[PDB]
């Protein structure tokens, strides 16, 4: 007598009128003229925006910082719109369209001569941000296939998650910090400037606590 189990019902879920992902334009409506600095600290450190679910239940989590250009948006769009069922699924963008201008000088020129011309636009992304959010009358095992396929093609470390796996990830990291048998931690040492260690550290290391090195995030660090 193989024991059967109840199944969740998604009848209470609603599907929008345009479930598929909208198209993203290469450049914004009005082209920018003022050239901007590199400002690399827009992909450095943890994210303070789009870290929680809004409408859906499954998403792609960013495990590192990077810049997204149009080529990335097309791959995500087509790959998802092709592999998903419009009737029982829907998807939305959790990242704005390319707005940061990237200048570039012409080939063969030497150092100097001013600043280059605007070549393309990107979208900065920090670690811990949701890139795409999905939902509908579907389990996670269904979308997890092509979401991970998408996550692997992104320029940073990404991974598909759900409302449960994301929560579990965060609770397991807190559990590690509490049961850690090591009496020495990066925070305690840095904040107290023990060994004069702040001579080889950064002011950001007071807040990142060793979990970030440039654009890379290290989840195994407590």
């Amino acid at each position: 007598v193989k024991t059967l189990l109840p199944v969740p019902s998604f009848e209470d879920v609603s599907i929008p009128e345009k479930p598929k992902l909208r198209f993203i334009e290469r450049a914004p409506l009005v082209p920018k003229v003022r050239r901007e600095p590199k400002n690399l600290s827009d992909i450095r450190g943890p994210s303070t925006e789009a870290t929680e679910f809004t409408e859906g239940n499954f998403a792609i989590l960013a495990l590192g910082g990077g810049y997204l250009h149009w080529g990335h948006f097309e791959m995500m769009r087509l790959t998802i719109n092709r592999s998903m069922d419009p009737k029982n699924m829907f998807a939305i963008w959790r990242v704005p369209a390319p707005f940061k201008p990237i200048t570039r000088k012409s080939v063969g020129h030497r150092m100097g001569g001013g600043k280059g011309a605007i070549d393309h636009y990107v979208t900065p992304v920090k670690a811990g941000r949701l890139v795409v959010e999905m939902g509908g009358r579907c389990e996670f095992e269904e979308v997890q296939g092509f979401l991970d396929q998408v996550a692997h093609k992104l320029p940073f470390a990404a991974k598909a998650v759900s409302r449960g796996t994301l929560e579990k990830m965060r609770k397991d990291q807190e559990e590690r910090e509490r049961n850690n048998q090591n009496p020495w931690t990066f925070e305690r040492i840095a904040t107290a400037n023990m060994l004069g260690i702040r001579k080889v550290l950064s002011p950001y290391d007071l807040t990142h606590k060793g979990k970030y090195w440039g654009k890379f995030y290290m989840p195994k660090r407590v």
Binding site: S106, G108, H109, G113, G114, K115
Partner: peptide, 18 residues
């Protein structure tokens, strides 16, 4: 070899007023 353009921004050489 290949010559390059110049900067179009002038000025901005004022010193601090203390």
């Amino acid at each position: 070899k290949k010559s390059g353009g110049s900067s179009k921004n002038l000025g901005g050489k004022s010193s601090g007023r203390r």
